[PDB]
Each structure stands twice: as structure tokens, then as C-alpha cells.
Amino acid sequence: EPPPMESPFQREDRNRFDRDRLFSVVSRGVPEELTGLLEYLRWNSKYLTDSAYTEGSTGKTCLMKAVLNLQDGVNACIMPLLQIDKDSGNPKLLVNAQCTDEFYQGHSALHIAIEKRSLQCVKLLVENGADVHLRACGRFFQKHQGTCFYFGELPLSLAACTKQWDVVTYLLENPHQPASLEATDSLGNTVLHALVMIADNSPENSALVIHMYDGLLQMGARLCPTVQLEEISNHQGLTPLKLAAKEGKIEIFRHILQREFSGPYQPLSRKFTEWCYGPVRVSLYDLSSVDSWEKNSVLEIIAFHCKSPNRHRMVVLEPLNKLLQEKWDRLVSRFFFNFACYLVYMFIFTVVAYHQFGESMLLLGHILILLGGIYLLLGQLWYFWRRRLFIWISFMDSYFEILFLLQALLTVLSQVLRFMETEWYLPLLVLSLVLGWLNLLYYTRGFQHTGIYIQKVILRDLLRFLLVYLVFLFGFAVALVSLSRYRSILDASLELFKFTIGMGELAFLRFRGVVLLLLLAYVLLTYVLLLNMLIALMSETVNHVADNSWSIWKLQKAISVLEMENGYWWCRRKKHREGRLLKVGTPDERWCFRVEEVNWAAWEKTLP
Amino acid sequence: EPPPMESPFQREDRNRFDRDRLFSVVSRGVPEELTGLLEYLRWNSKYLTDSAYTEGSTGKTCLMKAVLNLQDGVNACIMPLLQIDKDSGNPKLLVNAQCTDEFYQGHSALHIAIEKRSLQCVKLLVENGADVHLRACGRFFQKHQGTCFYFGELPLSLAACTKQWDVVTYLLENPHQPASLEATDSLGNTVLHALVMIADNSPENSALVIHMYDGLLQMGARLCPTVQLEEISNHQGLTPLKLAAKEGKIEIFRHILQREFSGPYQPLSRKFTEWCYGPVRVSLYDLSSVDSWEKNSVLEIIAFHCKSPNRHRMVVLEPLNKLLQEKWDRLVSRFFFNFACYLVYMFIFTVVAYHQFGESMLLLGHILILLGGIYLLLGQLWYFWRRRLFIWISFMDSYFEILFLLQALLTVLSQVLRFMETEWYLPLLVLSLVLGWLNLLYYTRGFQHTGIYIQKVILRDLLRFLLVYLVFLFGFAVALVSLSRYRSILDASLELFKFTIGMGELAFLRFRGVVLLLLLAYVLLTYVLLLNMLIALMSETVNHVADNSWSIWKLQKAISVLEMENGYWWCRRKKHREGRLLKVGTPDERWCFRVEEVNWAAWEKTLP
Ligand SMILES: CCCCCCCCCC(=O)OC[C@H](COP(=O)([O-])OCCN)OC(=O)CCCCCCCCC
Ligand SMILES: CCCCCCCCCC(=O)OC[C@H](COP(=O)([O-])OCCN)OC(=O)CCCCCCCCC
Ligand SMILES: CCCCCCCCCC(=O)OC[C@H](COP(=O)([O-])OCCN)OC(=O)CCCCCCCCC
Ligand SMILES: CCCCCCCCCC(=O)OC[C@H](COP(=O)([O-])OCCN)OC(=O)CCCCCCCCC
């Protein structure tokens, strides 16, 4: 149980001028009651930073108590208190004191002064030696589930996240101690990473994050021109663009990708207008950390490292849409070659399963099946060894890989069982047959007519529905079997399930009426449960949700393209860089991608 | 890869005053750096239009580069550059230079000056000899799929499509070279055709197209009164009204049909108010190119030449609604006579099929069936030979014609098989029987009670559903047959399909549990697929779409009427002209149709 940061109704725990009198004096704003505190500390060789003058559980000092009780942004005890601190000859400054609790670790008085929105307190603390790089690494300042406020752990990041431009300006340009825009917290996050991480998809917050990000970029260009603030990576290796891509923060993501400035801040732009003709606008976009020719690119992060539901809305933005379209058009022939090879392998496997000189052809077909199963096994194992996180974070768009792996495993295990002359090779062969013929439907995503053409529901409510239904099934099965001693529990469950799915009838002997009552109860309960499932499926459709199947199709195609670009396991494909190296101003050479857009509606609004 | 029209970041390809220095001078707006260019061209016998001074891939000249880099609508290098062109004695004028690339063919500097919305540049180019009839026929200026801007290929059409009335006025009335409103592009399209072709159904764009169309009609009446601008046909034989009808541009279509002016522009009207009494308003509408007594009329184009989904919304406008109603009321007796003849032919065919002196009556019935089949065959073949495009562009409202043709073909082929004494005549006879009795439902469109009473879905998702379902069926069938060696693949597919549609049961032998598992998997997968189809059918209905079955009924009746007006194949019907010849002002005699409307809501708003 963390204690409150400031409580008007609870005294601080402890786990002549004492702590209680000092706290009561600094909480009312009268400095004249501080007379005699310095002499007591000098006589007792005491300091106003030790455990006796601070809260025992946290370490909150009298300075922090004074800043927590501001009166119109100013407290009259802060300067006298720091004067007593200076005159006492304290080796450790009171202005740079931090709490030691695991909940408020690193929290200082400058953080409180910034949070209370008082430029006077911040100015007064900086002049007396406040460190502007003190990191608040407690659990209250980390982003997790519960009561927390993550802002980047830094005073400058706290000022930027709270919309205080005057505080940011004073922290960046002061004669005493300039704050650094390149400063990082415990996670390696800069102020731009912090602005990305506090961003949700709400419009007001998006406008806030965009404004603060643009202003900090401009002031960084004005103050530290030689360094690139957007090229700094945190401990996960992510730039703010990559961090926006991973966390699904769509608005700051589209703002960073399509950032255009006119005038002195033109080098800070990532989109450069090339030429306009009527409703045709042709622009050049920066491909820095966007093109997949580097590792850990934005495309790779969106496809295989993000878990947000905004992924399909992220691949339809420019320049990502045209880039993925060009990559797909480059890889159309490779996709359908794989489809044709898989179709031939299914055809051979089907012929061999149907026909289970003729002996030689059958052996050749069997060894072709074995080699194809080994190839599909090693290909899927390579995919899982590379991308074990992708299946975990998003099962809804990667279950075909598990199906291919299962089909390859069943094929190989059926063939080795056949070589050992076990008769059970045929069931596994026909299971591989049906599984591969189902797996042929993966390649329907190559066409728009078939790729766009309940999956979210059956991955979400299937386990709960199964729980309720097998509770019903097991109870009625044990009731029917124990009344018939229907021979075994599995037989009764099978009969009830086959009747429920319409595959068979019900067998109706003493106590026939009770058996009939049990059957009526089971049938009505299953009807109610299936009606519940049917209502749950009406719930998603009738609520008028816009059609996202096209963007989901482009996400599927992006995943397919980013897999085909690496080549096969046995032969790696050479990576080719997209865009061209062009100079966009002062020599600032960037790899740019040309995107041409036609928008009649936007153009006609500009027409006078 | 077409090069950019103007790139601030890429130099032009090439596939002392040179091209690079000249381009750099004309792109900054300083003419004083042009000193010495004329002497170099005179000494080298060079011209500023050759391949050495233009872009190699396109042919873009220095003049076009100068106009592409305007500064507040004016560039100070254009007049000195044209002065050097005049003094150099160039046989071909620089002001009339065009690009030669397949993407920008015919594109000149006047087009750029109009697109940049600079009256000063247009005036300066016209005074120095710019041709106002230069046609930009490149792929960027044709309407297709991709990056393009179609405007009519002409400078006047470009000015009209971009909402520049001052530019249109200057191009039409200037002392140097007057542009012609009768000028056509490569497709024969005038400026009115171009305004129709750039029209979509959005309200702002519709208001734009209406305003420009009306202004150009008024200025054409003021400038060239003796000619009719709306009577000009392009290379497809379409007037702007017919082009609006074919392309489905509903707003400009209703504006052209119901155009009413008061005062001097009264001859430009197509709707003339005759008399008003309370909420009753009675008007006269022009029937020029609207009545079907001419060929290629608006009714013919809407019914059989348009593919837009706005066709049913086009036949409910005045005067088309009352015209089609009058034609239908004139052709009610002809429709039900055809229905009665077809009903009698079905009755005879049914009696003969049921009864497969009695021999003579059976032979007479058989030859009556044969003659009726020949008549229906030749009637449908005539329909297809006339209207092969109509079935292709709209299958949803013409499949009954294919069904009638199929029924006639099966009838004739069954009769010739019967004459050859092959026993297989009876299956084809009963197929013709059921097909004709289904085809009897075509005539339900004659009544409002039955004509208004999923078809879009089963013509759109049927192929995709069949693909997925026969993938399921074929895989489970080969798995079941290869596990039973269920005797053949077709037998197993038939059994599974019959169980799926409820027509039969499932036959359940070694490996019975694996057979059961395959059957469970197939049943659950088919349940999921049918549930997907059911959800897809909920999607259209619950989204609150307005009832368009009445307008779809009138479209069906319009198709029926426009077919009955031509008569039968053996006897052509005489065409009668609708409306009456009346003088509507200065002698301007038009064939007019009287339409009476009652609108209480519109009338009461005018009441003070
Ligand atoms: C014995 C084969 C040895 C390798 C020879 C070259 C085979 C072609 C390689 C190939 O194109 O892969 C085809 C297909 C790829 O599956 P996927 O990763 O696209 O799907 C991934 C979906 N998640 O994978 C298959 O279909 C395997 C078929 C193996 C036999 C191929 C017969 C034709 C040879 C030219
Ligand atoms: C355990 C073995 C049997 C179950 C696996 C069945 C094999 C896969 C067949 C399948 O899922 O159908 C694929 C089809 C299109 O997939 P997609 O575009 O959503 O691309 C895939 C990524 N979303 O989707 C549909 O047509 C809808 C019907 C889906 C069938 C039931 C769901 C099966 C989930 C395992
Ligand atoms: C042997 C017939 C020789 C011609 C004699 C005159 C027959 C009447 C002609 C007629 O009205 O056509 C009837 C019907 C028309 O079909 P449809 O174009 O309306 O439908 C088009 C739908 N898309 O087409 C038919 O039903 C064919 C029936 C032929 C026997 C008629 C028996 C009654 C004779 C008076
Ligand atoms: C291959 C032979 C068997 C299939 C053809 C069936 C013969 C035609 C029967 C039919 O389509 O029903 C006609 C009826 C009204 O048609 P309509 O007003 O939409 O006018 C027709 C123009 N839209 O529409 C309905 O009542 C709805 C039921 C439709 C039946 C299934 C659709 C068949 C499509 C071929």
C-alpha cells in the first residue's frame, strides 16, 4: 500500500524543530516560523535531508512538501528552506533529493513544480541547482496496468507531455543548466518516444502530440542542428516512427510519415511535393527505416511485431500502400509459381492416395510425397524459428502456417509409418489429403475477386461455447448411461453430438419416460445455446461497421510479400532497395519514393 | 516510367548556353541572365526547340519549364525567351511546341498557363501566337485507370473544367485568335461532352458542371447563335445528353432534361411551363433525341447501353416517367397477348409430355411444340444478334432471355432426337417443361402487385462460394474414397452434397472412427460456410437501404416496352412519334410532351 503523495487528511508515516513542525510550517506558506531551524541543525550536526526529516516509507523531503502545497504557483518557504540548506553545509543538495520508495523512485521537487504548472517554482529551483535530468523510475511513473502516469521519467518530458511550452523553453534555454533533448530515461525513450507512448487515437490527444512533436523538432533544429532526434533508438532498437508503428498509434504515425513543412523547417519534412496538375498531386516520401531492405523496418514491425487492431489501417497509408503494391506486383509471378507447385504436389498426392510399371510409379509417387513433406516441414520450421512471436500476437492471420506445418508433419509421419508397414498409415495419409486440399485456400488472397471473400468470433467465443456445451453433454451423457446400466460415456456423448449436428438420431427398457425427459431437456438446452451463438453472430453484423476487408486483404498481401522477399530457406533472395537517392535540400540525400495521387474532392475545394 | 512534369529534386534526362543553364535561368525568374543566348543560337545555327534544348524523353521546352515555375502568376523570362525565339528566325514557333512522349503527347505551355490559373500568362502567350486548339492526347490526359486528368484535351475545355471563367472569356473573345466552342478532341468530345465526362454524382461537382454548362450554353448563344452546341455528336454518335445517359451521370442528366430559363435564354430551355393551378404544375418537355422513334435515343441508351447502377434512377425522371407510362399503357394488350400465347403453348406442351384419334392428336401436339420451339428460337436469336452487349453489361435484368433461348434450344433438340427415335428425348422434354414453367414467371412484371415481388448476391458471391465449397467437397470426397478402398469420387461428392442440402443421410469397415472424424469436420466446415453466407445476406438488408424495387420495376417495364415497340421478328411494328410539334418561340418548332405534376409540399412553401 503506497502512501499518498500529498494528503490533507493523513499524516506521513515514520517507518525543537522536528519533521512534523517543519512540514506544518512549509504547508502554510509562512517563512517567518523557520527561525531557529538552522541553529538546531548546526548544533545537532543534522541536515534537512536525513531520515528523521523525511517520510520513512518514501523519502519525501520538506522541499517536496512545500512544492506540493503551492499558493497561486508560489510558496514563500522554498527560498528560505534552500537558504538554510546552503548555510547548513549539506554535502548532498536538498534540491536534488529523490524519493526511495519503489512506487515514487526518483521523484523530485522539480517534477512537482512542473506538474503544478508553476514557472516561478521551476525557475527558482533551477537557479539553486536543480538537476534537469533526474529520472523518476518508480512504478507510478512506468506505464503498466493500474494507477500510473508515464511521461518519460524526465522533467523535460514531463513538461512536454503536460502542454507547458514556457517550461520546455526555460528548461532548454537557461544560463544555469540546459536540459538535453537527447536525454533518455530507463527505457532509452527520448521526449519524442515519450510523446509517442502517451498517444492514443483520440483527436484532441492526437492534436496535442502532433503539436508538441513538431515544436520540439523545430526547437531541436534551432538548438542542436547537427544531430537527428528522430534517429535515436531506445533499448528495444526503435525510433519514434518505429515505436508508433509497434504500439499502433495511427495518428502520430501518419503525421510522421507524411510530414511536410514549408520554409526554414523544410529539412524536417518526410514528404516533399513534386508537382501538381489539377486533381493530380505527385510527391516524394522519405523511405528511411520504412523500406524492408533494412532489418526491423516499419513494414516488418507492422506485419510481424504489432498486436494492435490498427495494423490493417496502417498499411493503407502513403507511402506504404504504393510501396506494398509495387512489391506485390514485383512478386506476383513468385506467388503463383508457389501456388502451381503446391497444386502439382496435391495432384500427385491425391493420385497416390487414390491408387493405394504400376509399382515403380507408385514408389516414385511415394518418394515424391516424402520429399515434398520434408520440404514443407523444413520451410515451416524455419518460419516458426524466425517468427515465433507473430503466431502468438496474432493467430487470426497466421493459422495457415500452422496448418501447413501440421500437414507436413502428418505427411512425413504417415510415410515413415508406411515404411514400417504399420496399417495406420492410411488414416494419416487421408488426413494429410484433406488438410492439404483445405490449405489450397491460402492462395485465394492473390486475387481481389477471391482474397476479400465469423473468424474473429470463432477464435474468441469457441472455448467458452465449448465449456458450456461439453458441460451439458457430459452431464446428460452420464445421466443417460447411469440410467441404462447407451453403454459408455463416450458413446452417449457421440450419439448426442451427432443428433445435435444432424448426423444421426436418438435411441430411446425401464424408465423410458425419464430418458425422454432427459432428451427433451438436452435438446431444449442445446437449442437455447445455439440460439445464443446465433444472436452473438447477429451482434457484430447489424451494428453497421464499415467494410475493412479490403484493408485486411492488403495486410494479408503485405505479410505474403514480406515473406517472399526473404526468398526460400534453401535459396535466399537478394534484397533490392526501393526508391532513388535524391537531394532534397541542404547535401541532404535521401532515398525517396514517388507517389501519385488523384483526389477530385480535395482539389475542387481549393477552386475559387 | 514517365518522368515528372516538374521536379524540384530531379534533373531532366537527356535520352556556352546549354539546356541546363537555360533551365536554371528560366526557373528563377531573372531574364538578365539570358544575355548571349541569342548570339550563341545565331552562331551555331541552333534553335531553342531542338532535341538539345529540350528534355529527351518528353520534349519539354524551356518555355514550358518557365511556365511550370511561375511566381505569383507571372514569370519575367517568358517574354524575353519568346523574343529570342522570334529574333532567331525559328520556322516552328516555340509557343506552339508540344511534348512527344506517349504520356504527355500534345501538352503545351498554354495548358500549363491555364492550369496554374494565370490570366497574365495566358494573355501573354496568346498575343505571341499560341494556338488555342492544341490537343493534349497523351495517356495522362485520357480517362483511364491510374494517374490521369481528362479534361477534353483542349485549352478551352481545360479552362472550363478548372472553373476559370475569365480564361474562358479571354479564349472565346480575343482579337488575336478566337477559340471555337465547336472544337473537338481526339474522341470527338466538345467542351460540353468534357463537362459531362468529368461529372460524378457528388453535389459540389454537380453544381460546378451545371454552372459551367449553363454559362457556356449562354455564351455560345451570344457568340454563335446559328449553331446548336448540344446537337454535336462525338465519334460514338453521342450528344452531351446521350453521353450523360450512357455514363450514368444522373445530376447533369436531370438538369439537361428539365432545363428551364426565363428571359433572353428561353430558347435554350428544354422544359417549358404551360400552366399552374394550386399544387398542379403542367409543363412541356422537349423530346429531341429522347423519344425512341429515332434510333440510339436516350431511352435505348439507358435501357440497353448503360452499365451504371443509376439506370433505375434515370427512368423515373420527367419526362421519361410519363413517356414510359404512356408507352406501357399503349402496349398493355400486346404484353398479355404474348403471355396468353405462351401460357397456351405451355398447356399444350404439358399435355403432350403427360400423354407420352389419340395418335393423330399426339402428332399434332408434337408438331405444334416443334413450331413453337422454332418460333422461340428465332425470336431469341434475333434478340441476341441485336443486343449482344446488353446481356454482357447487365446480366441481372436479362437472364430470362437466356432462359427462353435455352428452353427453345432444348425443345427443338428434344424433338429432333424424338424423330431419330433416340430414347433420350424424354429427359430433354421434361427439362424443357420445367424450364418453360419457370419462364412463365417473366410475365409477373405486368402487375404492380407481382412485378415488385438476393439476386444481386447470387450473381456476385456464387462463384466464390462454389470455389470454397467444392474445395471442401473434393477434399473430403477423395479422403473418404481413398479410406474406403464410397466407391467413386462423384458418388462420395453426391452423398455429401445430398446430406448438406438435406436430401439424404451419411453412410458410416476398418477405420470407422477416422471416417466419423472426417464427417464431423466436413459438417462443421459446411455449417461455418453456410453461416458465412447467411451473415453476408444479413449485411445488405439490415443496413437500412431505401426501397428501389419500384424504380427497378419501371426499368424492367421500360426494357419490355422498348422491346415490344420494335414488333416481332416476322412483323415489324410501325413506329409512332410521341408528343406534338409546337412552336416554343423564335420559328423554333419542337416535338413537346405534356407532363402534369401534383406537388402539395412544394406548393405550400411558396404560400406566404
Ligand atoms: C521436392 C521439392 C524440392 C524443391 C524443388 C523446388 C520446389 C519449388 C519451390 C517452391 O516454389 O515452393 C513451392 C511451395 C511453397 O510454399 P509457400 O511457402 O508459398 O506456402 C506457405 C503458406 N504459408 O511449396 C511446395 O508446394 C512444396 C512442393 C514440393 C514439390 C514441388 C513440385 C514442383 C517442383 C518445381
Ligand atoms: C483443424 C483443421 C480444420 C480447420 C481448418 C480449416 C482449413 C482452413 C480453411 C479456412 O479457414 O478457410 C479459408 C477461408 C479464407 O481464409 P482467409 O482469407 O480469412 O485468410 C486466413 C487468415 N485470416 O476462410 C473461409 O472461407 C471462411 C471459413 C473458415 C473455415 C473455419 C475457420 C477455420 C479456422 C482454423
Ligand atoms: C407457331 C406460332 C407461329 C406464330 C403465330 C403467332 C404466335 C403469336 C406471336 C406472339 O404473340 O408471341 C407469343 C410469345 C412471345 O414471347 P415474348 O417475346 O413476349 O417473350 C420474351 C421474353 N423474354 O411467344 C410464344 O409464346 C410462342 C408460342 C407459339 C405458339 C403460339 C400459340 C398461339 C398462336 C396465336
Ligand atoms: C438454371 C435454371 C434454373 C434457374 C433459373 C430459374 C428460372 C427463373 C425463376 C426466377 O428467377 O424467379 C423469377 C422471380 C422474379 O424475377 P425478376 O422480377 O427479378 O426479373 C428478372 C430480372 N431480375 O424472382 C424470384 O422470385 C426470386 C427467386 C429467383 C430464383 C433464383 C434466381 C435464378 C437466377 C437465374
Q: What class does CATH assign to B19-313?
A: mainly alpha
Task: Indicate the residue type of B192.
Answer: L
Is cis: bond before B319, omega within 30 of 0?
A: yes
Query: What's the grid cell of residue B402?
Result: 437466356
Tell me the residues of chain A between 264 and 303 that have a Cβ less than 8 Å away from chain B: 272, 274-275, 277-280, 282, 284
- The CA-based angle A486-A490-A494, given to 5 degrees, is 80
Residue A524 Cβ contacting ligand 2 at under 6 Å: no
Distance CA B576, CA B567 (A): 12
Distance CA A36, CA A17 (A): 8
Distance CA A445, CA A550 (A): 11
Distance CA A261, CA A283 (A): 13
In DSSP notation, B532-596 reads: HHHHHHHHHHTT-----HHHHHHHHHHHHHHHHTTB-SSSBPPP---SEEEE-----EEEEEEEE
CA distances from B585 to A561, B264, B267, B596 (A): 68, 11, 7, 21
CA of A452 vs chain B CAs: smallest distance (Å)? 10
The answer to whether the CB atoms of A275 and B524 lie below 8 A apart is: no
Task: Indicate the residue type of A408.
Answer: A
The answer to whether the CB atoms of A538 and B539 lie below 8 A apart is: no
Size of interface A-B (CB pairs under 8 A): 132
Report whether A264 contacts A218 (CB < 8 A).
no
Distance CA B179, CA B167 (A): 11
Phi first, then psi, for residue A171 (nearest 5°) are -70, -30
Give the three-class secondary structure for B378: helix
Report whether B495 contacts B504 (CB < 8 A).
yes
- The coordinates were experimentally obtained by cryo-EM
Distance of CA B489 to the CA centre of its chain: 46
Neighbouring C-beta atoms of residue A608, cutoff 10 Å: 5
Phi first, then psi, for residue A591 (nearest 5°) are -80, 110
| Cβ within 8 Å of residue B366, ≥6 positions away | B352, B415, B418
Q: Are strands A280-286 and B280-286 parallel, antiparallel or unpaired?
A: unpaired
| Cβ within 8 Å of residue A359, ≥6 positions away | none
CA of A338 vs chain B CAs: smallest distance (Å)? 18
Distance CA A151, CA A107 (A): 12
Mutate to test the interface with A, among B478, B480, B533, B538 (most CBs of A within 10 A): B478
| Cβ within 8 Å of residue A246, ≥6 positions away | A238, A301, A305, A306
Positions of E strands within A502-588 = 580-583
Rounded to a whole number of angstroms, the distance between the first and last alpha carbons of chain B is 65
HSE (side-chain half, CA atoms, 13 Å) at B431 = 16
In DSSP notation, B97-159 reads: ----SSSSTT--HHHHHHHTT-HHHHHHHHHTT--TT----SGGGS-SSSS---S-SSHHHHH
Q: Are strands B271-277 and A580-583 parallel, antiparallel or unpaired?
A: unpaired
Cell numbers 403427360: residue: B354
Query: What's the grid cell of residue B101?
Result: 512522349
Mutate to test the interface with A, among B99, B147, B198 (most CBs of A within 10 A): B147
Query: What's the grid cell of residue A287?
Result: 523511405
Distance CA B210, CA A439 (A): 55
Query: What's the grid cell of residue B274?
Result: 404551360
Q: Kindly give the distance from the C-alpha atom of residue A568 to the centroid of ligand 1, in angstroms, as a whole number.
A: 9
The number of residues in chain B equals: 608
Neighbouring C-beta atoms of residue A33, cutoff 10 Å: 16
- The CA-based angle A207-A210-A212, given to 5 degrees, is 105
CA distances from B221 to A430, B218, B264 (A): 80, 5, 10
- Alpha helix segments (H runs only) across A315-398: 320-330, 332-354, 358-393
Q: Kindly give the distance from the C-alpha atom of residue A597 to the centroid of ligand 1, in angstroms, as a whole number.
A: 38
Distance CA B493, CA B486 (A): 9
Distance CA B175, CA B182 (A): 18
* Sign of the dihedral defined by the CA atoms of residues A289, A294, A300, A301, in that order: negative
Distance of CA A597 to the CA centre of its chain: 30
Give the three-class secondary structure for A421: coil
CA distances from B37 to B12, B49, B80, B125, B198 (A): 20, 13, 11, 21, 43
Residue B396 Cβ contacting ligand 4 at under 6 Å: yes
Cell numbers 512537482: residue: A112
* Sign of the dihedral defined by the CA atoms of residues A168, A174, A176, A177, in that order: positive
Task: Classify residue A155 by burial, with Cβ atoms within 10 Å: 0-12, 13-18, 19+.
Answer: buried
* Resolution to one decimal, Å: 2.6
List of chain A residues whose C-beta atoms are within 8 Å of the C-beta of residue B516: 494
Kind plus residue range of the DSSP H or E element containing B296: none
Report whether A591 contacts A490 (CB < 8 A).
no
Rounded to a whole number of angstroms, the distance between the first and last alpha carbons of chain A is 65
Distance CA B134, CA A429 (A): 71
- The CA-based angle B451-B452-B455, given to 5 degrees, is 100
Query: What's the grid cell of residue A292?
Result: 524492408
Query: What's the grid cell of residue A234?
Result: 531506445
Report whether A196 contacts A252 (CB < 8 A).
yes
Query: What's the grid cell of residue B495?
Result: 452423398
Report whether A283 contacts A273 (CB < 8 A).
yes
Positions of E strands within B222-338 = 271-277, 280-286
Q: Kindly give the distance from the C-alpha atom of residue B184 to the centroid of ligand 4, in angstroms, as a whole number.
A: 45
Distance CA B177, CA B171 (A): 8
Q: Kindly give the distance from the C-alpha atom of residue B502 to the centroid of ligand 4, in angstroms, as a whole number.
A: 22
Which is nearest to A109 in space by CA: A70, A152, A165? A70
CA of B247 vs chain A CAs: smallest distance (Å)? 18
Residue B279 Cβ contacting ligand 3 at under 6 Å: no
HSE (side-chain half, CA atoms, 13 Å) at A321 = 15
How would you label B432-467 residue by residue, b for 16+ Cβ within 10 Å and e otherwise? bbebbeebeebbebbeeeebeeeeeeeeeeeeebee
Angle between helices B358-393 and B399-419 (to 10 degrees): 150
Give the sheet arrangement for strand B280-286, strand by strand: B271-277, B280-286, B589-598, B580-583
Tell me the residues of chain B between 208 and 237 that have a Cβ less than 8 Å away from chain A: 208
Chain breaks in chain B (C to N over 2.5 A) after: 15, 356, 453, 485, 508, 586
Q: Are strands B580-583 and A580-583 parallel, antiparallel or unpaired?
A: unpaired
Q: Chain B within 8 Å of A430 (Cβ-Cβ)?
A: yes
* Sign of the dihedral defined by the CA atoms of residues B553, B554, B555, B558, in that order: positive
Distance CA B475, CA A354 (A): 12
Residue A396 Cβ contacting ligand 2 at under 6 Å: yes
Neighbouring C-beta atoms of residue B148, cutoff 10 Å: 18
The answer to whether the CB atoms of B528 and A454 lie below 8 A apart is: yes
Q: Chain B within 8 Å of A582 (Cβ-Cβ)?
A: yes
* Sign of the dihedral defined by the CA atoms of residues A385, A388, A394, A399, in that order: positive
Distance CA A151, CA A148 (A): 10
Give the three-class secondary structure for B289: coil
Residue B261 Cβ contacting ligand 3 at under 6 Å: no
The C-alpha R_g of chain B, in whole angstroms, comes to 34
Query: What's the grid cell of residue B352?
Result: 403432350
Query: What's the grid cell of residue A601?
Result: 474532392
Give the three-class secondary structure for B464: helix
Residue B165 Cβ contacting ligand 3 at under 6 Å: no
Q: Kindly give the distance from the C-alpha atom of residue B568 to the centroid of ligand 3, in angstroms, as a whole number.
A: 9
| Local structure of residue A57 (DSSP, 8 states) | T
List of chain A residues whose C-beta atoms are within 8 Å of the C-beta of residue B467: 444, 450
| Cβ within 8 Å of residue B143, ≥6 positions away | B150, B197
In DSSP notation, A196-252 reads: HHT--S-HHHHHHHHHHHHHHHHHHHHH-TTS-GGG---TT---HHHHHHHTT-HHH
Task: Indicate the residue type of B49.
Answer: T
Task: Classify residue B23 by burial, with Cβ atoms within 10 Å: 0-12, 13-18, 19+.
Answer: buried
Q: Chain B within 8 Å of A502 (Cβ-Cβ)?
A: yes
